[PDB]
């Protein structure tokens, strides 16, 4: 009853925590995204809404340089017009839900930046591979 049993950090465990502690376990939010005659079409139209919005983030991940690696550096620099925050804070001061509000204007500039920064790097691998 003393509660000493190991209790692994469950789903959404660091959801209020900082980024340096939320990025410790990212797989737990990843893996509960696919698994977990008219009330069968409410099962059907929940399943076929789940697999497109799973495939859409797996495609936006796929069309960058990050096939299934789930954490990846890139080459674009961080323009301070986007966030203007210090680096030493934004890994232990703020939180991720505060980040999605803190960045949501500046999204679709980054998402537009990622395809061209990947396909330019892509053709540069092709120009490297073509000469040899």
């Amino acid at each position, epitope marked *: *009853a*003393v509660g*000493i*049993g*190991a*209790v*692994f950090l469950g789903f959404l465990g660091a959801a209020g925590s900082t980024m340096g502690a939320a990025s410790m376990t990212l797989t737990v939010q990843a893996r509960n995204l696919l698994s977990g005659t008219v009330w069968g079409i409410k099962q059907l139209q929940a399943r076929v809404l789940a697999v497109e919005r799973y495939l859409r983030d797996q495609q936006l991940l796929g069309i960058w340089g990050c096939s299934g690696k789930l954490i990846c550096c890139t080459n674009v620099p961080w323009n301070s017009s986007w966030s203007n925050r210090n680096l030493s804070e934004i890994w232990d001061n703020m939180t991720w839900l505060q980040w999605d509000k803190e960045i949501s204007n500046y999204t679709q500039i980054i998402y537009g930046l990622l395809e061209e920064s990947q396909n330019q790097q892509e053709k540069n691998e092709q120009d490297l591979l073509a000469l040899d």
Partner: antibody
Amino acid sequence: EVMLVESGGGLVKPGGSLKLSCEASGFSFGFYSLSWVRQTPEKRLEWVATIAGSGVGGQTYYPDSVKGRFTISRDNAKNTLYLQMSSLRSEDTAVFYCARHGEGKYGSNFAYWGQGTTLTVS
Amino acid sequence: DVVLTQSPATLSVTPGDSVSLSCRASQTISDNLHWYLQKSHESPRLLIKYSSQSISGIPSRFSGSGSGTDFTLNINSVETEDFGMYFCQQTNSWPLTFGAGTKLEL
């Protein structure tokens, strides 16, 4: 498998201080609550300290005979457990074992014990 | 505090026989009682968890039973390697406490 290897035992005068160590392997160290239990020369087992795991709350627990005197801590990144002793007494003389608990609801038991390091206070 | 009383303190049995070791708690611990074997010159080894739950790697001859305050560890054909010091342990309340041990001799 689970391996627990303690070090730091020695002969200490009463009132002195001593840090024991337990180097663990074979499991996800931070998730488990870990304890020090000592075995007296009469072979009696007396629980000495517990520090909860990262998903257990990470608090420390001590019995009344040592509370305010003994401090258990862990450094999860290197998978090492520590037992910091101050105001030592001759009654503390024992073999000290590091022990790992189980998982979930059925895991507050000691699941694995180390080899032990000997403390003699006289 | 929960006091754990192990009985008997010492018991001599011939290898091949079966034994029942008692551990009695000063308060109810619903099922929070575990058993350990410590052989001579060795560290303790977990035998039985939460009154009755078996442990991977421990032989099937170790069995546990009991509920509340009274718990029993059965060893149903004792082997030479089973002789040693036997401990019960409670997790119902702080502080964690042990029984005094049963010494099994050959």
